[PDB]
Amino acid sequence: MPVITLPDGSQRHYDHAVSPMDVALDIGPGLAKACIAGRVNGELVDACDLIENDAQLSIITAKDEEGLEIIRHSCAHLLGHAIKQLWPHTKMAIGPVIDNGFYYDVDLDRTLTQEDVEALEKRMHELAEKNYDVIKKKVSWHEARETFANRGESYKVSILDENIAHDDKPGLYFHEEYVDMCRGPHVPNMRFCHHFKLMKTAGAYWRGDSNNKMLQRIYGTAWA
């Protein structure tokens, strides 16, 4: 039965767990439509994450710096969604947000031409414009590993095997048939990710080790 306190001092008493989106809807339709994520007791969370106990809550929107970062991060997921359609055998490594954009390191047997990059961006726009919901599932380390093993995503499996504690609960983000793993937050729906562009590509050794495979780094940027 969490008591949720908003920035303006208002307090809402609930007798069940509620998500930032649930509370936003209670405040008004406009705020719910603008909601991208939330900050609960100082921590950024997805709009769908349940708040079990008393908490200070604030709603993150595209007007927030945090919202812009989340939009950029979801555009990295969008790149994965699109590239896995164009070249299904592609393996996804790491795709973080960077100052003014994002990038995604990938393993594909096709040395990307500028035409390939343009085709990838075109598919990204088509997918984002479908305005599909992003579905999040908090899972065990073991379920996360099985999910990526079943997809043949060896780099994601490697991150779980050597970089994520077994007691950690990875966040899985489902973008239609595509799935990625992240601390997030991510956008609740791709309608927030219509403004982006892919830029250049470069090379980067997996884990920065020249004994490992040279991956292709695809850079992009996004804005509200």
Give the strand pairing for 91-92 and 101-107. Answer: antiparallel
Q: How many CB atoms lie within 10 A of CB 78?
A: 28
User: Whole-angstrom Cα distance, residue 167 to residue 115?
Assistant: 43
Which CATH fold would you assign to the domain 130-187? Replication Terminator Protein; Chain A, domain 2 (3.30.54)
Q: How many CB atoms lie within 10 A of CB 56?
A: 12
Q: How long is the chain?
A: 224
CATH 3.10.20.740 describes domain 1-64: no
The residue ranges of every structural domain in the chain are: 1-64, 65-129+188-224, 130-187
Whether 34 and 3 have beta carbons less than 8 Å apart is answered as: no
Handedness of CA 4, 62, 172, 191 (dihedral sign): positive
Amino acid identity, position 215: L
CATH assignment of 65-129+188-224, given 3.90.550.10, 2.40.10.10, 3.30.980.10, 3.40.50.2300?
3.30.980.10
Whether 123 and 80 have beta carbons less than 8 Å apart is answered as: no
